[PDB]
Structure formats: structure tokens, C-alpha cells
Assembly symmetry: D2
Homo-oligomer: 336 residues x 4
């Protein structure tokens, strides 16, 4: 009916209990600490809601109908806009001094952010691998959770992640067919050709040739399926070789109509990874200003180990001159 | 003590019920609409908490001890940092299209943002006067409220506002005493002299339109500057609600502006700055809200546009002191002679 | 090639002369005032560069190849990202107090922001109409300029605006053909039918305040929705400048709104969204500028003229916003269906 | 008289954009954005140098001794942090350039590099980045990328008093440290020693349990930390390794201001300390955002050097952050009753 009832403000606005006050020593700034976290958690719930809806669109086959790509990209863009706000939101907690935090910090133990169910659900559903987590005090992340919460966390690890669902979709990208546009075949040939030409051309001058060799190494390593499988097992890469080919197809042919919105999707996945890392960085800096080894553990989380779509960033390494890219003639254009 | 229990997430995260889904027609974006408003309301509660603490510091006399000024200005600064975030937060709801909003809008009636208790408490506690409010549907804002909420709103109108508490503190500003530094007396004299000196320079300037323009400016400025010493004009503008602060409080504020670098006035000057910031940010919030209603409902909108005005700027008198700026050399000299009182 | 030479820093970083210092009374904050404006002007030059490139893609027919829509939308999105930064940039100038501004203001006369060539070029190229400009002190804007600057401004007024180039492209939107999908014909019929059905339902209620309230709302809605099919009212509102797009372009825009998820319309829909964003951000820039003039100069005028610029009179793509007025239940939208689906499948 | 464009020297600022891609007959649209973005960074670096130089001068010439000048000091330092915040947000503009599009004009840039930003180096030096602390790139000194007057300017920047040194000297003179006066350090050592003793008694009184044992463990850690503060030799040692930067006495002054921040004479000094930390944090955020962007454009040498810059070795006021380590219960802080308080009253 009424605003307050529709938003269940009877719950939202009766959820602030200062432990400092419960123990007979109310500290003003504890209220800000509570509200800040409650606001983070409301937005985490919203991100989960968007992300779960996008996972469902992939898992139920709806993504196959390309009419649904706009909704997919809008919701992923919305996740990024929320994360941007969450990064800015640290500026509020920076109005609390370490001295004032020090007056109520004692009443917090043994509570910790490590116990944020939703933050973990979000990491898992995007596709952070448990085996790839940095241990804190030689402990498992789920050790802090019990009951239905531990159950929910397990489901989040076992259900298909955003990374896995995107991977599957990337594997079906049009153009990879050897009997068709044969993208991979043509790309290998064109680059090999071009490098040899560069070889002849070059045949400080000499160190320029030295640089050429480095590029040759990098570019050719792309066609090494085994090296990929090895790096996959480590966890230094995350996407299947075939998904990687699909992604590169979308990068190079981004302007082709069928690939325009898919390209935007890839861009937004990278954005989410970057913003997640920015959130972790801002959080680290705050612990440092307040507590003066959590700080070092948190710093370790600011790493490629926690970047789920690292493969999408790394495709910049394999940029080539435009004229080496297999031409998409109107003859072939039809499929795109 | 576990995170979720300390933050009472059992309440906060079980407070999201889509009306579209309750009526068997779940619309995805209704969830965003709910969360966005819940986040606004959490932050309004935080602003009320800071603002109530500052009101108390004034009302109970603690502000008299100047050691408390840092805390006062930090909390007022913190309110403006929150408001800045609340302005940016509109960007989230701008990811909802009007078409998608149109799919669940029917399930909202009869709820409205108009019915935000906390938003009204915030306006009232800052110092929005009821008699100065633009009518909605040719009726008073409080009619949209009933029961304990209507009663709380009345208390919020009758209890001392931030404007009134700052006013009383401004009235006691050191320097105004006729038997002391006699700021107002000296300021009137120095401006009178300064204007005269200016006139002499102007009349000598060769007959020309440029001179003519300078003459025009001089007359305008003369009018403005001298009008400052007209206590009757002030009382008149107070009754029409075009000004808000007592004449004496205005004198205190101007004292702080001109002598802001003097140690006792440094943090008071920051307080005045922060009060203006809060007014400006409140206005920016109202502007962004208007633009969004327009993008969703098309061309309520007109009432909201009417709220974007000086009628809702409680500390308008602090902004308007820019009108009465004079060259630095006209400002009464303090000097070591009478420097140590500040 | 050195950084400083590539960026011509010998020019950029030797362009700061304080007039207060030239007249023997250096005021520290004047430096901030100079740099802030120089930074605004660099970004205005960048906006003109993006906007000119997009205008050209339309004017030369490149937009007809839908491969170029990604570039169009990325550049329009980039303009909005810049404008958002320019709005935030006011926060720097708010660290200057009015008292400190008052110490060097005298040395500025008779220079004014009104003399920003690039800001005028930007307004003109987007599509602000001269007739719809608020007069300042009963004077025309362009007489503040002379020589080549006056000439550049005239070209900007006479060349095709972004609004006109988008209009032309909207007129060619697939689906409007009476002998084809016949969007307009089907939309008129569906809404007429829908309204009739609605009326019957309400008519069948018992006489009450509630019934009459519903009747009243129905009549309001009916008038709005049906007014859309009145080409003559549209022509009339065009001449008063309350609308800007041709009737046919309006039909194209509504086609893109309703069928946004169809593949050929996905990126076009994003373009329309970005055009609305640019108008909103331009207006936000104007609003933040007004608030600052007030904080520095006080009320009384400049403040009042600038406030008048914050109005729909300066919103070029007002017709895109106002399509929210004509939202209808989803089930009244003519079905696209596989039958004709392909015409919007790339 | 004076016209906007002349006042701002726009004839220089807006004729400073030459695309190397275009000079070599292969114009690439996005190179223009690359140029403008850097030019805008450089304008704001010039503004930060202007504010920072003015504040350095206020310290170096003794003006800071008159506490009337503290408001101007804190406003200008706050203004530096508001600019830096904008500079961090400004990366969002260059993120609208894709790596593919950057790849089309990158070849025309060699051998120019950001490393060659005079102003960025001047800024690092004037704040107080010490040369010995700098990470070498390709086993070279940073200044060897510079020649002529530029090399000379950089040398002056290294030799003149840094903000770190000027703040250090001012912190050493903080009221309250005098053994013959309030004797802050003497009283603080005694109160902490007493407090630790009291704490030990409380814990040892607890009933045998692991929690007690944990509290014992915590106590022993905290005791060592807090008492290590009174070890001037440990401080000298940490200074040599560059893990601390401030003199022992300056550290005492800083802690005095932290604990007595509400006392009137220390209110604005406390804000100054806060602002110095803000600048360091924002400088490191700038370096972080720059790293992330190099990676997204070039992929994963430079990247690793730049990552090494995102470190406490480039935080000049790291000591101000680290004072959080030495927080004690409020009741242990030496009492300042109005009697003694008199010395800290305007
Ligand atoms: C006073 C401000 C803050 C302090 C001092 C602080 C402190 C800490 C510390 C020390 C840790 C490491 C785990 C531990 O030892 O308990 C941590 C982790 C965490 N904090 Fe915070 N925190 C603060 C603000 C926040 C905020 C606003 C959030 C928002 C929800 C948050 C969420 C988290 C999360 C999710 C973790 C786990 C991080 C991970 O495992 O990757 N913290 N925090
Ligand atoms: C789709 C987004 C929104 C729409 C369409 C919307 C619409 C409206 C409308 C039409 C009114 C005028 C009263 C009425 O006739 O119902 C109004 C007022 C109001 N809205 Fe919103 N609103 C939106 C978002 C928000 C948000 C996010 C807030 C955050 C709390 C909010 C707070 C308010 C407040 C407090 C009022 C009363 C303002 C006053 O009297 O000055 N609205 N809104
Ligand atoms: C201290 C800050 C500022 C003051 C006091 C100020 C004052 C004014 C005034 C009074 C006008 C009206 C014309 C006149 O009477 O001379 C004006 C217009 C203008 N100002 Fe500013 N201004 C400020 C900052 C800026 C900045 C940062 C920009 C950025 C480019 C700017 C750009 C303009 C423009 C373009 C106009 C013409 C606007 C229009 O006609 O729509 N000003 N300003
Ligand atoms: C596509 C954008 C950019 C790329 C690819 C890039 C690349 C690089 C690289 C590779 C370096 C290491 C030095 C070298 O190997 O040449 C560097 C350093 C630097 N860049 Fe950038 N940069 C970018 C944008 C910017 C911008 C916008 C600024 C603003 C002025 C900037 C300022 C600098 C500075 C000052 C350094 C030296 C930093 C230090 O030594 O700590 N760069 N950049
Ligand atoms: C909710 C409640 C607390 C937090 C914290 C947080 C930040 C700093 C802390 N220092 N001590 N504690 C409590 C003790 N716990 C468990 C034992 N040692 C590690 C931390 C803190 C808690 C951050 N976010 C929160 C949300
Ligand atoms: C919570 C619930 C609703 C809202 C609204 C909001 C926005 C647009 C609306 N259109 N109709 N309604 C409901 C009816 N009200 C009252 C009676 N007629 C005027 C509008 C809307 C509600 C904004 N914020 C909300 C928070
Ligand atoms: C460049 C140069 C000046 C400005 C201004 C600006 C702002 C406030 C002013 N008050 N007086 N003046 C000078 C005189 N002008 C023109 C003639 N009479 C009306 C005001 C001001 C100039 C804003 N942006 C600028 C950029
Ligand atoms: C001005 C000019 C160039 C830049 C760069 C920048 C960024 C990436 C680059 N990749 N190659 N180059 C050119 C070669 N330089 C110098 C010699 N070898 C190391 C890299 C680049 C230049 C960033 N900001 C700039 C401003
Ligand atoms: C039919 C298909 N949508 C094919 C597909 C997969 N990945 C893509 C990327 C861009 C464009 C198309 C695709 C599917 O099976 O999902
Ligand atoms: C002792 C006093 N705090 C004086 C006072 C009032 N307003 C001020 C403004 C600035 C500086 C001081 C004051 C009081 O009576 O509150
Ligand atoms: C061939 C065409 N590009 C068709 C066209 C015009 N407007 C559109 C809007 C959405 C989709 C397509 C169009 C042209 O005539 O430009
Ligand atoms: C007289 C003095 N301004 C004293 C001083 C030094 N550092 C301070 C920090 C806070 C407060 C005062 C000081 C000076 O010697 O500069």
C-alpha cells in the first residue's frame, strides 16, 4: 500500500543496533559503520539479482536468440554502474577517523567482513575458483560459515558460473568452422606470411630485429593448443582454447552487425573484473588507514588470481596490423 | 557476534517483496526500484543521525566550548559527502528504461516518495518553513501523513531547527559589541568613505560611455551596499520569508566571512561553507530527481520543478553575502591592538 | 619525438598569464580560474572533434552501412563520458571562495564566458535554434563575436546539425512502409481497439466516485494516445518550436523504441539513449554553472539569464524524451513475428 | 579590451593538437583523444605545482608561524586533493579508447613516453619522493631522460626543501613536547606503561581458558608495539631503511596533534595532516589507475616497473598513516585540563 510498507521500512530502518550502546558506552560513529555496510549489502543483493538473471538467460538457452543480447548487456552494464557507486561509497567511510573508529572497534569482535555471505556468493557466481583463493591464516574461506549459509555457498561453487556460461556461448561463435570462414586457419597463415615479410624487410637497426623476434614468439604461441591446456591446468588462463578463438573472432570483427553487441558484452565483463578489483583496492587502503596480516592478505587479493576474465584482457597482447586480419568480404558478410 | 547478526541482515535482506510478483506478474526491474529507495532511506537515517547530533550540541550549549567545533564541522562535512553520493546514486536508476518502469508502475499505487517520513524530517530539521512550502494538489504536505507519523512531523516543525540554532550562535559572534571592536559601526563608515572616494575617481574620468557605465555600476553598488545598513528593510524581507536570519545573526556571519583567517573564525568559516554545501546538494538532489521523473513519466513534474527554488534554500542568507563584497582595503583593520580577542 | 614536443607543451604550458600580476597585484587564485577554463576548452575541442566525426558519418551516407553504428554509438557515449567529467570539474572551482574571486574579478573586464566560441559551436552543431535562444540584455549572442569567429559561428548555424542528420536517418527507419509492416497503421488500429475495450469495462461498473475517477483517467489517456495520430497538431507544434523532429522521424523513433530488442534496432536504440544523455548532461553543465555564478556574484541579470537557459528551450532532443508520454500496454504493440522478423535480422 | 580567448591564450592552447598519424599521411581518429587527455593532465599538474609551491613558500619563509595562515594552507592542500580526485576520474575518458584503436596509431608515438613528463617528476620531487627510494627503470636514473634547462629544473626540485622536510620542521616545533612544559612524551610513556600493567592484571585474573591465552598473546604483541614507540634507536634504524621518513621529534608532534585534535590550536593542523594523507592516497590511486590502463592497452616490462610504483615506497607521508598502529584507549591519553589547556587556546 503505502511507501513505508511497500519498501518494508519497518525492517530496514529498525535494523541498526550499536554494540557500543548495548554495552553502555554509545559511540557516535558506530552508526555510520553499520549503515555503510547495510548499504553495501543491499547493493550486493541487487548485483546478485542481475547476475543470476543473466546466468539464467545463458543456462536456459534464451541467449541463443540474439534478440536477448540487449537485455544481457544492459544488465551487465547496470552491474558496472552499481560497482562504480560502491567504489565511490568508500569516500563516506573515509570521513571516519582512525581515532574515532578505535573507540568502538573493541565491540565488533569477533565479527568480520570475511563473514559476508553475499560477497562470497558474488565471487563464486562470477567464477572465482576456490583452489585459486589465497588462504588467510592457512584456512578455508567457507570455514567461517555454517548451516544453510555453508549450503548456499556450496551450490554457488557447484552451479555453472558466469565464466562457464560465457565460455560455452563463445565456443559456438560463428566463423570458427574449418569448412566455413575458417577463421583460425586463415589467421595462422596470414600472420606467418606477414612475419616472414617483416623478416625480409628488416633483413639500433639490429635490435629492432631483436624486438621482431619477441613479437614472433608471442604471436605464434597463440596457435599452441598444448601450451594453452597447460596454462589452463595451472589456472593462469580460464577459457577453453575454442572459447578464446570465439572471443578473438568477436574482437577482430566487432563492427560486423551480429558482433556489435557481443563485443559490448565482452567489454562489460572486463569492466566488472576491473571494478571488483578497484573495490578490493579501496577496501585495502581503508584497513590500512584504520588498523595501521589482514592488510597483506587483502593486498594479495589485488591480483590476476582474482580476475576471472583475465583471458579477455590478455587478447591485447595478440594485436596484429589490420591488413593481416582475414578479410570479411560481402560474399561472406551474409553470415554476419 | 557474526557480521550478519551485527548488521541485522535478517531484516535488511528480507525486506524486498516485488508487488508485480505478489500479483502473479513478476517484473525484473521492480527489484532495482525497491533496493534503490531502501538505500536512499538508510542514508537519510544516517543524515538524520548526524544532523540530530549537531542540533543537540547547539541546543545544550556544548557549542559554546570552541573545542567542539571540529566535530561539528566534520559531521556537517560528512552530511555533504553522503548527499554527494545520493546525487550520484541516481545514475543507477537511470539504467531502468521508461518502458520497463511502465511494466510494474501499476502495482505501486497508492505509494509515493512523497510519503518518505525521513525526507520530510530532514527538510524540517534543517529549517524548511511549512508556510513557505509549495502546496501539492492545493493542500499541505502533512496531509499525506497520518497517526504517529503526522505527530512526529509536527514535533520536527516545532522543535528548534538547525537554522534557528545556528542563528542564535551567530548572534553571539565576538566583534559586534558597539563598546568593543564595533564591527558594524566601522563597516558602515568605511563603506561610506569608500563609495565617496570611488565617486571622486569616477567624476574625474573623462566624459564617455565607459565612464557612464562606471557611473551606472557605482549607483547600483551604492544602493546594494547601503541597503545592508537598513534594519527595517531586513525586518520586512524576513516577514515575506525572502530572508531567514535575524539582522544580528547576519552581522555575525559577515564578521566571520571578512575575518575568516583569524584563528577563532577559521573553523566557524568552514561551518558556514558546509551549511551552504548542504543547501546546494539538497537542491542538486531535487534537480536530479525532477529530471528522472521526466524521463520515466514524460511531461507532479511541475510541482517538483517548483521545489527547485530559493524557497527551499534554508541558508539563502549565507549565499547572498557575496552580494555585499567590498575591496579588502575597506574592511575594518583588526591589528595586534585588538587582534588577541580572536 | 619527445613527450613535450608531441603534446606541444611549449604552447599549452606557456599560456597562463595572470592579469592581476600584469597590473602589479598578483592574486593566487586567478591561476586556478585560468587553468579551469583552459581545461574546459580542451575538452570542448575534443567534443567538437567527436561530434563533427559523427555528423560526417551521417552526412556522407556512411551510416547507411550498419557496420558503422558501433563507432557512432561509441563516440556519442564518449561525448557523454567527457560531459560527466566536465560536470564534476566544477568541484575544483568550488574550492575558490567568493571573497578570493572578488580580489581579481576587476582585472577580468570586459572578458566573459559568453565569448566561448567553442561552446557556441557545440550548441549550434547539436541543434540549438537561434530563434529559441533567450536574449541577454536585449542583444543577440553572435554580435559578441567579430571577424573569422563570427564567420565560423555562421557556418555552424547553416551546416546540418546533429538533430537534422538524425532526423533524416530516422525518416528512413525500416517498418514505416504502408505497403510493408505498416507500423503506424497497425499502431493506430490497436490503440483504438484497446481504448474501446477499456471503455466497455469501465462503463460496466456501477456509478461511483471510483468509476468517475477511472472515466476521467481514461479520457486523459485517450486524448494523449490519440493526439499522436494528429499530423496537423504536430506541424503546428513544430512551428512553435515545442517539437523539433518531423512527423515521419517521430514514427521512426517510436518504431526503434517499441522494437528495441530486434537485432537491427539494438544499437540504434542505444544511440537514441545516448542523444538523450547528451542533452541531460549539457543541461546539468548549465545548472552547475548557474549555481556557481550565484555563489560568487550573488543574485543580481546574469544569474537570471543563465537560469532561463536551464529549460526545454535548450533541449534539442526533447521529442526523444517525450516518447515516454506514449507508452501503451505491451500487448497493444503490433506483433513483429517470425513472419516479418527477418527484415530486422542482420 | 580583453577578450576570453586572449585572456586564456586559446591561440596557444587550441593550436597545440597535431596528430602524428596525420603528419605521416594516415590520420587515426582516436589519436586526438590521446593528445587532449594528456594535455588536460598537464594543465592540472601545473595547477597542483602552483598550489604546492605556494604552500612550500609559506613554510620556508616562516609565514606558517603566524597561525592565521593555516586556513589558506589547508584550503590549498584540500584543493590539491580535489584536483587529484578529478585526475583519477579522468582515466574513465581514456577507457573509451579500445586497445585495437590505440594499436592503430601507437607506432607514431615512439620514442615519446610519459616518463618524459617534466611536471610529474617536479611534483614527485617537491612533495618529497627521495631519489634513493625510487625504483630504477632499466637500471637508469629518472633524470637521465631529461637534458638542458629541464634537467636543471629537475635538479632544483631535488635540492630545494620538499613539502616533507618543511612539514617535518613545523611538526618539530609543535606546542606540548617541551619537557619543561606539558612534557607530552614523558607523560605518554608513563601512562602507557601503567595502562599495560593494569591490562596485564585484568587478563591474568581471568579463569583459565583458551580465550584468556589468546588475550595473553594479543597483550604481548600490543605491549611490544606500544613500547617500541619509545625506542629512539629503533626509529633511527627504520629511518635508514626508509620504512619511516619523519624525524623522531616530528613524529611526536604529529601524535600530539592526533590525540589533542579537538583543542582549538590543533583543529586546523589536524585537518592539514588528514589532507597530506589524502594526497598520498590519491597519488597512489592515480598510479594504480595508470597501471591498469597500460595493461589493458599494451598487455602484460614497463607494466612491472609501474606496478612497483604502487607501493608505500612512493608514499611520502607513510608515517602519518602508520600512527594508527599506536592507538591507545582515550583514558590513557595525558589529561589536558583547561588550566594546562590554556596553552592550546586561540
Ligand atoms: C573500518 C572499515 C573497515 C575495516 C577496518 C575493515 C577491516 C577488514 C579486515 C581486517 C579484513 C580482513 C579479514 C579480517 O581479518 O577480519 C576485512 C575483510 C573484508 N571486509 Fe572489511 N573493513 C572495513 C570496511 C569494510 C566495508 C565497508 C565492507 C563492505 C561490505 C567490508 C567488507 C569486507 C569483506 C567482504 C572482507 C573479506 C575480503 C576478502 O576476503 O576478500 N569491509 N575487512
Ligand atoms: C522511477 C523513479 C521515480 C519516479 C517516477 C518518481 C516519481 C515521483 C513523483 C511523480 C513524485 C511527485 C509525487 C507524486 O505525485 O507521486 C515524486 C516525489 C518524490 N519522490 Fe520520487 N520518483 C522516483 C524516484 C525516487 C527516488 C529514487 C526517491 C528516493 C527517495 C524518490 C523520492 C521522492 C520524494 C521524497 C518525493 C517528494 C518530493 C517533494 O515533495 O519535494 N523518488 N516522485
Ligand atoms: C568564478 C566562476 C564563474 C563566474 C563568476 C562566471 C560568471 C558568468 C557570468 C556572469 C556569465 C553571464 C555572462 C556575463 O554577464 O558576463 C557567464 C556565462 C558563461 N560562462 Fe561563466 N562564470 C564562471 C565560470 C565559468 C566556467 C568554469 C566556464 C567554463 C567554460 C564558464 C563558461 C561560461 C559560458 C560558456 C557562458 C555563456 C553561457 C550561456 O550564455 O549559455 N564560466 N559566466
Ligand atoms: C593508452 C594510454 C597510456 C599508455 C599505453 C601509457 C603507457 C606508459 C608506459 C609504458 C609507461 C612506462 C614508461 C615507458 O615504458 O615508456 C608509462 C609511464 C608513464 N605515463 Fe603513461 N600511458 C598512458 C597514459 C598516460 C596518461 C594519460 C598519462 C598522463 C600524463 C601518463 C603519464 C605517464 C607517466 C608520468 C609515466 C611515468 C610514471 C612513473 O615513472 O612512475 N600516461 N606510461
Ligand atoms: C561488521 C562488523 C565488523 C567489521 C569489520 C572489522 C574491522 C576491523 C576490526 N578489528 N577487529 N574486528 C573484530 C575482530 N575480528 C575477528 C577477530 N580478528 C579479526 C577481526 C574488526 C572488524 C569490517 N567489516 C565489518 C562488518
Ligand atoms: C515506492 C513506491 C512508489 C514510488 C514512486 C512512484 C512513481 C511513479 C508513480 N506513478 N504512480 N505511482 C503511484 C501513485 N502515486 C500516488 C497517487 N497518484 C500519484 C502517484 C507512482 C509512484 C516513486 N518512488 C516510490 C517509492
Ligand atoms: C574568462 C574571463 C572572464 C570570465 C568570467 C567572469 C565572471 C564574473 C565576472 N564579473 N565581471 N566580469 C568581467 C566583466 N564581464 C563582462 C562585461 N560586464 C559583465 C561581466 C566577469 C567575468 C567567467 N568566465 C570567464 C572566462
Ligand atoms: C605522449 C607520447 C606517447 C605516450 C605514451 C605511450 C604509450 C604506449 C606506447 N607504446 N609505445 N610508445 C612509444 C615508445 N615509447 C618510448 C620508447 N620506448 C618505450 C615506449 C608508447 C607511448 C603514453 N603517454 C604518452 C604521451
Ligand atoms: C546461435 C548462437 N547465438 C550463436 C553464437 C554464439 N556465440 C555468438 C557470439 C556472437 C554472435 C553469435 C553467437 C548461440 O548458439 O548462442
Ligand atoms: C563563546 C561562544 N562560542 C562565542 C561565539 C559565538 N559564535 C561564534 C562564532 C565564531 C567564533 C566564536 C563564536 C558562544 O557564545 O557560543
Ligand atoms: C539503410 C539505413 N541504414 C536504414 C535505417 C535508417 N534508420 C534506421 C534505424 C534503424 C535501423 C536501420 C535504419 C539508412 O537509410 O540509413
Ligand atoms: C608558532 C608555531 N605556529 C607553533 C607550531 C608549530 N607546529 C604546530 C602545530 C600545531 C600548532 C602549532 C604549531 C610555529 O612555530 O610555526
Amino acid at each position: 500500500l503505502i511507501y513505508g510498507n511497500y519498501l518494508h521500512l519497518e525492517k530496514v530502518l529498525n535494523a541498526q543496533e550499536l554494540q557500543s550502546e548495548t554495552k553502555g558506552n554509545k559511540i557516535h560513529d558506530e552508526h555510520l559503520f553499520i549503515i555503510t555496510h547495510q548499504a553495501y549489502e543491499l547493493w550486493f543483493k541487487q548485483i546478485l539479482w542481475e547476475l543470476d538473471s543473466v546466468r539464467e538467460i545463458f543456462q536456459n538457452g534464451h541467449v541463443r536468440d540474439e534478440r536477448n543480447m540487449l537485455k544481457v548487456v544492459s544488465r551487465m552494464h547496470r552491474v558496472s554502474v552499481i560497482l562504480k557507486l560502491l567504489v565511490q561509497q568508500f569516500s563516506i567511510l573515509e570521513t571516519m577517523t582512525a581515532l574515532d573508529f578505535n573507540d568502538f572497534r573493541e565491540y565488533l569482535s569477533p565479527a568480520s567482513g570475511f563473514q559476508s555471505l553475499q560477497f562470497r556468493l558474488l565471487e563464486n557466481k562470477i567464477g572465482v575458483l576456490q583452489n585459486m583463493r589465497v588462504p588467510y591464516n592457512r584456512r578455508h574461506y567457507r570455514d567461517n560459515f555454517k548451516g544453510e549459509e555453508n549450503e548456499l555457498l556450496l551450490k554457488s561453487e557447484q552451479e555453472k558460473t558466469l565464466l562457464e556460461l560465457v565460455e560455452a556461448w563463445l565456443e559456438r561463435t560463428p566463423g570458427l568452422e574449418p569448412h566455413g570462414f575458417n577463421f583460425w586457419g586463415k589467421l595462422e597463415k596470414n600472420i606467418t606470411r606477414g612475419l616472414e615479410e617483416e623478416f625480409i624487410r628488416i633483413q639500433e637497426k639490429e635490435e629492432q630485429v631483436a624486438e621482431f623476434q619477441k613479437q614472433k614468439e608471442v604471436l605464434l604461441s597463440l596457435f599452441d593448443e598444448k601450451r594453452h591446456e597447460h596454462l589452463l591446468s595451472k589456472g593462469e588462463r580460464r577459457l577453453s582454447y575454442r572459447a578464446l578463438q570465439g572471443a578473438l573472432m568477436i574482437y577482430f570483427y566487432r563492427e560486423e552487425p551480429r558482433f556489435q553487441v557481443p563485443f559490448q558484452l565482452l567489454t562489460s565483463l572486463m569492466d566488472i573484473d576491473s571494478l571488483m578489483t578497484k573495490w578490493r583496492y579501496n577496501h585495502v587502503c581503508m584497513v590500512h588507514r584504520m588498523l595501521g596480516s589482514g592488510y597483506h592478505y587483502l593486498r594479495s587479493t589485488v591480483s590476476d588470481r582474482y580476475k576471472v576474465f583475465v583471458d579477455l584482457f590478455n587478447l591485447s597482447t595478440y594485436l596484429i596490423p589490420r591488413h593481416w586480419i582475414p578479410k570479411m568480404n560481402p560474399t561472406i558478410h551474409k553470415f554476419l
